[PDB]
Paper text:
Genetic studies indicate that in S. marcescens this lipoprotein (SmLip) makes an essential contribution to the basic function of the T6SS and to T6SS-dependent antibacterial killing activity. The protein fold is dominated by an eight-stranded β-sandwich and identifies SmLip as a new member of the transthyretin family of proteins. The pro­pensity to self-associate using parts of the SmLip structure that will be exposed in the periplasm suggests that this protein, exploiting the lipid anchor, helps to bind and position different components of the secretion apparatus at the outer mem­brane.
The structure of a Lip construct (residues 29–176) from Serratia marcescens (SmLip) has been determined at 1.92 Å resolution. The structure is that of the globular domain lacking only the lipoprotein signal peptide and the lipidated N-terminus of the mature protein. We now report the high-resolution structure of SmLip determined following phase determination using single-wavelength anomalous dispersion (SAD) measurements based on the scattering properties of iodide ions. The refinement proceeded with the release of NCS restraints and the incorporation of water molecules, an Na+ ion, ethylene glycol and a number of side chains with dual rotamer conformations. This data set was derived from crystals grown in the presence of chloride instead of iodide. However, we did not assign any chloride ions to the structure, noting that typical water molecules occupy the previously identified iodide-binding sites. The asymmetric unit of SmLip is a tetramer with 222 symmetry, but the assembly is distinct from that previously noted for the transthyretin protein family. The accessible surface area (ASA) of the SmLip polypeptide averages out at approximately 8350 Å2; the range is from 8200 Å2 for molecule D to 8510 Å2 for molecule A. Each molecule in the asymmetric unit interacts with two of the other three and two types of protein–protein interface are formed between molecules A–B and C–D (interface I) and between molecules A–C and B–D (interface II). This interface is formed by the antiparallel alignment of two β4 strands.
Numbering used by the authors: 32 to 173
Write the structure that this text describes.
C-alpha cells in the first residue's frame, strides 16, 4: 500500500536446473505475498508445492507463478502489495532439491523506511528487486 506495488526481475543461469547427465530445464518460480515468513521458512517443500494456503494459513496473502528458461535474463513479475504485507517469499522448484537454496524471503519495508512519501508524495511507488535462479539456488543481486 505504501508503496503500493512490487516487482522482481529474474535472471536464470544457462546451467540452472540440470540434473546429473541432463540438459538445463525451465524452472517453476512461485512468488508469494506474505503477512509473515515464519511458516513459509519452516514449511517443507511438498506442503508448499501441493497446498500453500493450507500450510501457510492467514500468513498467505497472495501468490503467482511463472517458468524461467535457462539463460533467460530480465523476466519481470510483479503485483500489488497489501497494507499488512511484510515479506515476499520466492520458491524455485529445482528438480534436484538437495543443497539448493530453493526458497528465499525478502522483507518489505516497514513504516519507518517509507516515511519519505508523506513529504515526497510523487516518488515512484514500485519496489524493485533482482533475483538470480542460479545453479546452487536463488539469490538476490547487489
Amino acid at each position: 500500500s505504501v508503496p503500493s506495488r512490487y516487482s522482481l526481475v529474474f535472471d536464470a543461469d544457462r546451467q540452472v536446473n540440470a540434473a546429473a547427465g541432463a540438459q538445463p530445464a525451465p524452472i517453476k518460480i512461485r512468488v508469494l505475498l506474505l503477512r509473515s515468513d515464519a511458516e513459509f521458512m519452516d514449511a517443507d517443500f511438498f506442503s508448499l508445492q501441493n497446498d500453500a494456503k493450507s500450510v501457510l494459513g492467514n500468513s498467505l496473502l497472495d501468490s503467482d507463478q511463472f517458468f524461467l528458461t535457462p539463460g533467460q535474463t530480465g523476466k519481470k513479475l510483479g503485483g500489488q502489495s497489501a497494507l499488512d504485507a511484510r515479506y515476499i517469499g520466492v520458491i524455485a522448484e529445482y528438480q534436484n532439491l538437495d543443497g539448493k537454496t530453493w526458497r528465499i524471503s525478502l522483507p518489505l519495508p516497514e513504516p519507518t523506511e517509507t516515511n519519505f512519501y508523506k513529504v515526497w508524495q510523487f516518488s515512484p511507488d514500485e519496489l524493485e528487486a533482482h533475483i538470480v535462479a542460479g545453479v546452487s539456488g536463488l539469490r538476490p543481486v547487489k
